[PDB]
Amino acid sequence: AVPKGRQVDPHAKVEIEELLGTRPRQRDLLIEHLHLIQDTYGQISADHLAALADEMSLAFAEVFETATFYAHFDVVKEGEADIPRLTIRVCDSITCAMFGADELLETLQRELASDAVRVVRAPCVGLCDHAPAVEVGHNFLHRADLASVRAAVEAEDTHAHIPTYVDYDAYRAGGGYATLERLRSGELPVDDVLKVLDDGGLRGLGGAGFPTGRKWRSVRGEPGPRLMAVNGDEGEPGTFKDQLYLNTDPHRFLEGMLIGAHVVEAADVYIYLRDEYPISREILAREIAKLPEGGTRIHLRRGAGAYICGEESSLIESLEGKRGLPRHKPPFPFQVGLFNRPTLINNIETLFWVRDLIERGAEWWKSHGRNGRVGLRSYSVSGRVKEPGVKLAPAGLTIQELIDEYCGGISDGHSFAAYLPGGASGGILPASMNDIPLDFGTLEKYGCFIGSAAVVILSDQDDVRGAALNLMKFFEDESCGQCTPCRSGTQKARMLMENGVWDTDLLGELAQCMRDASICGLGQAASNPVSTVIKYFPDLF
Amino acid sequence: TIAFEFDGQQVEAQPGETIWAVAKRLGTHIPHLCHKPDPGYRPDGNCRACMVEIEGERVLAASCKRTPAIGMKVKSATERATKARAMVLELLVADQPERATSHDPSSHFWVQADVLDVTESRFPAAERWTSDVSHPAMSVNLDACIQCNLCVRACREVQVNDVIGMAYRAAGSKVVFDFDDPMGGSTCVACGECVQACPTGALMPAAYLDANQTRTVYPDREVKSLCPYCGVGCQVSYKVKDERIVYAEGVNGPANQNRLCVKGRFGFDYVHHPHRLTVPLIRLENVPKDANDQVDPANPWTHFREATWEEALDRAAGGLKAIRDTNGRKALAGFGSAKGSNEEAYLFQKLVRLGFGTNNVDHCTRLCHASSVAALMEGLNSGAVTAPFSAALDAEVIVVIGANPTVNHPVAATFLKNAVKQRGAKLIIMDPRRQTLSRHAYRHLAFRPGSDVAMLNAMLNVIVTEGLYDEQYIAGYTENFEALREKIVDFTPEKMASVCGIDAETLREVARLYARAKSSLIFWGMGVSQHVHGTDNSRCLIALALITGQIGRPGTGLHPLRGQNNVQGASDAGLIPMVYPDYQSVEKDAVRELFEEFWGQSLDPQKGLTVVEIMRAIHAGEIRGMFVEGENPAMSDPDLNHARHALAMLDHLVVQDLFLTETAFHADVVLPASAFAEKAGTFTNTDRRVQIAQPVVAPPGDARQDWWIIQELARRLDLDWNYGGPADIFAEMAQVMPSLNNITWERLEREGAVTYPVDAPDQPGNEIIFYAGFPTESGRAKIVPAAIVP
């Protein structure tokens, strides 16, 4: 019998005792204590995991299982190598790949890499329009090159650079929470807010399209003390819209968040923005502390890789301080939320627009719309476009229109060959099908969807099959590995495509299995690039 | 009930039944890898082998985890579902090592794959983790792992040992133990629950594999019996390979939920020990019976000599006969064993009562829990637990004062952990030293050793002065509630905090929580009992349970943890020198006459001497001649000139042990006994359940059954006993034991176990006793205060 195990070192106990101070030692804050240890010390030493488990009355298995799921926590045991102080991350994703990310990754992985710096790949940092994107110790470099990264590293320009944004007083000078103040006081009934929200037809902008008013009403119907969470994960490779609104007009989002909390009576709300957004984190921390006291207490939570944590059940489980594994859906997350209490989760995009509907009317929202579709959408456009960035355009906008009316053209020396609507989650489409309106319910008949309005333009200078391989590798790395079809199917599909010619029939069968028997939406869409490139690019096999 | 449609035909589903369970009931079972249809395993739908098609849904559903709702239409034979299941199996097979030299090539996974006709895979295999063999008893080879997660449920939900987890993401997600260590140095307790929960050979016992980690041994025979280590009555299924026990699996007993500890999984090798007595031994006349002599177990012929089963047996039964007929009937005594069957214990005490004609019957295992049983009998007229340890699943507050079940009754501790982790149960560990259960404890009242009566009296004073007691229960079911009320005033938390180790506010909180709880069980062991003057420790515990009313209803009672195979059934058999079988007083004239007429011989009126009394009387020479069965008094109590010297002064010692133990060093005749593995009979556990044991192997050499030796000694003592086996002995003793009234050998063979206070043949017994009064003459219990007189 060998039940001894590993003895918590006394030195590691005092360090976590002083480190935690008076913070609550409840499992719900496990991820946050992991962040605290990872930040105070560039790694999470095994003795530190043991000390944290002792302080939080957990098992070593529990803390290790939680802390090795996120790709930004560096567990280091007695035999592992010490992580260097500076960690520069090179995005390896479709757009940064178009702009020489892999070549750049190799370049600075052999030139400025050393024992004092670590160069690793990253899925995506929402900086696609400024590709290639590289992070240097919380400082993300736009259109990174060898010289720029070298200057950043040698100058110690590691910390994030906070931009100029409308502060709390500036927001007061205009809107200034007047709509919220008219809600916290009985001047406009909550029924009117829901009525206008439903009439406008605003739909969830995180990549589902579910009406916001319906979510709010359904959660309001559920009894008991309700809760609310905000999805700032925005992990889709082609999506950067949310970061733009966080770092420009945070208080519009905060007003929407407070309106949603009041409409639901949620005593408190949680924000789950990425750790790839130091700018947004600092902005919210500054402005979260300037709102008036009372109302609903608002918590700002931080992520760690784990693209899957953007899934609502996964986000719930991550907020619970455990692995961001999604949940089965006999119980919906609005019925049984994070603490088993009904909660609504909304993207920071949809919270950004509620104020305008309440103050400017539903007719304003329904006045826009290019094709038969209605509404207003923020498009994240990157790649082979003359002007890449977030485009606030009407709904039902065909990609040809979105390119030659908002992007200023395609490029010099490039031709429009293929595009992917909705990002990696959606499938690649040929440029010959440019007459397809882009909206929530107009892209399914082609096996695609536009979740976050992430649009990446493929030219004739880039191979569609390489793009599909990149997307498959992204899904393979990002799957939480809970169910079989996703965990194993992503790996098998990636393996099948490292060959010169892959088996179309086998890939189709595996894609059908993945799409039919996967637990969450990550695996139900992981095979979309493969099937789409097979179907709409017959002349590539 | 839900009247839904499955595979085109309407069916009915019991409440809480999943679609998979309904399908299995109707016979149309479907593949399952992550789902383990055994008690205690929560269906997790992460294998997607159980996929079915239910109308109205955009995707397939895991009948593993999904329950049928009214109007639901399910189809599992459709092309969609069959293809999805086959693709899942194909992916996993592509990940599998092999099916010729693999780990458990007949595993559950391979059976399910054969069901789906998935022999090979079209998808490339992937390199996996290396085999790990650090732990001696069981080898993990994750290269076969399916990530079905069953092992984490087994370690963290069923046993709640918390030594397993899936820490990585994606395909890299692997099974770890604690910080991904090789297990051989982790906190693993080797209970084997994960090994019994793996659907592949990724987790196997190390005795089924070889150097190459391929399955080698397939046990030809498997026999189900009990575990002779704990008093928890943990049922086992022993695996026999070439007339040897090579592995043990837990079965669905009523005390264990298919779960064992390390001692049930392994440790069976004691039966096949090389140094196991096989032939009777007689002490040769040349060798003197030295006080400090040590017989070599490897060389038992330095002090003893070979002899047939009629020479040694005659010597044993003749020395005692001569002693009784010359020195007197009061010069003999016998020590039974709480390790043998109830039929052996009854037969042994009957021999010591008839052939020796006295009451000098006492098994050394009763010294521990002696005080607790004394107090429980004084207050309640019954020494048995009031509730099963499975009652913790219904109790709101659990008290584990003075016990360490996680080490000594691991399955009971697992049930306590399940109560905590699945119900709103608050367990309080009232132990001076920190305990593994402390991490799951609402409070841990670490108090100075010996300062237990003080703090329990403080809790009683809190309950009394605060009016927490329910006057309704006292007035109608108890006596003497006013006597303590006079003296409880003196003991108060403010004063008792100093002498104790708990602050007054903590004592107040614990007492209030215990009193106001709807249900509240108390568990205790040797910590309070073996402590000098352990009757007071028990007395105040009974007072707490009694004034508060926490007794006689589900989730409530007093359950001292008996740490021996069948000490409870040994006492029920009459191995006590102060009472007959079934706790019938030996001094009562009516009881004496009942046995005198039934046993057909005059019986000794005066109560027999206790084990310590016998040991100290050996020194005075009042008692000369013994018969020790399944006990080692030579190394039980302090043995310098009180226990070892006592045995050497015996005129004639007979011992019936499995090994040439220390107590057998001074034995004139050694009787090779059969172990629990190679014996039949019945055993009673701490839970008060009577279970039947079965032989798995044969005794080494010509070693005989214990009851056979006892009967032979009786026959040579003129008793003329004729029993054909344990069944006849059980019937005879059931004819005289009110406890075993409506239970028979035929009924005990079926159903595995029967809690003996039963009313009808088909009734399940009375797990909770004292529900409608107490067996006391007045029909109500007594509240006895505890006296502190240092």
Ligand SMILES: Nc1nc2c(c(=O)[nH]1)N[C@H]1C(S)=C(S)[C@@H](COP(=O)(O)OP(=O)(O)OC[C@H]3O[C@@H](n4cnc5c(=O)[nH]c(N)nc54)[C@H](O)[C@@H]3O)O[C@H]1N2
């Ligand atoms: N696996 C296993 N099972 C066994 C045994 C074994 O060695 N291993 N041995 C057997 C033994 S002979 C008997 S029959 C039982 C033992 O049953 P147990 O209850 O386990 O007896 P102990 O282990 O000696 O102590 C139990 C707890 O009492 C606490 N304690 C110590 N001092 C005090 C005190 O002054 N007051 C109080 N209230 N508590 C105190 C101790 O810290 C300890 O945690 O289990 C038996 N079964």
Ligand SMILES: Nc1nc2c(c(=O)[nH]1)N[C@H]1C(S)=C(S)[C@@H](COP(=O)(O)OP(=O)(O)OC[C@H]3O[C@@H](n4cnc5c(=O)[nH]c(N)nc54)[C@H](O)[C@@H]3O)O[C@H]1N2
């Ligand atoms: N040094 C020491 N002394 C102790 C204790 C201790 O743990 N250590 N424990 C103390 C208290 S708490 C209790 S545990 C006791 C110790 O507990 P004991 O029961 O007195 O010691 P064991 O060796 O466990 O008892 C088993 C004995 O009976 C035999 N035996 C086992 N099974 C069978 C069987 O199926 N049939 C037959 N015929 N014989 C069998 C074994 O060979 C051995 O001689 O005394 C106490 N004294």
Ligand SMILES: Cc1cc2nc3c(=O)[nH]c(=O)nc-3n(C[C@H](O)[C@H](O)[C@H](O)COP(=O)(O)O)c2cc1C
């Ligand atoms: C794998 C996966 C990842 C997702 N990640 C995000 C995300 O990072 N941000 C987001 O707003 N929605 C994300 N979604 C969409 C979810 O619907 C989201 O968690 C939530 O529903 C947003 O609600 P809303 O549309 O009402 O704002 C993701 C969905 C899936 C399947």
Ligand code: SF4
């Ligand atoms: S589909 Fe992928 S991410 Fe979703 S639960 Fe299954 S393995 Fe995890």
Ligand code: SF4
């Ligand atoms: S043998 Fe028991 S303690 Fe060890 S890993 Fe398996 S379930 Fe956990």
Ligand code: SF4
């Ligand atoms: S070790 Fe066995 S039980 Fe555990 S996840 Fe792997 S296949 Fe399942």
Ligand code: SF4
């Ligand atoms: S808990 Fe007790 S009865 Fe059950 S296997 Fe372990 S030692 Fe044997």
Ligand code: FES
């Ligand atoms: S930052 Fe590189 S693809 Fe988004």
Ligand code: FES
């Ligand atoms: S049958 Fe559902 S995962 Fe095993």
Ligand SMILES: [W+6]
């Ligand atoms: W004992």
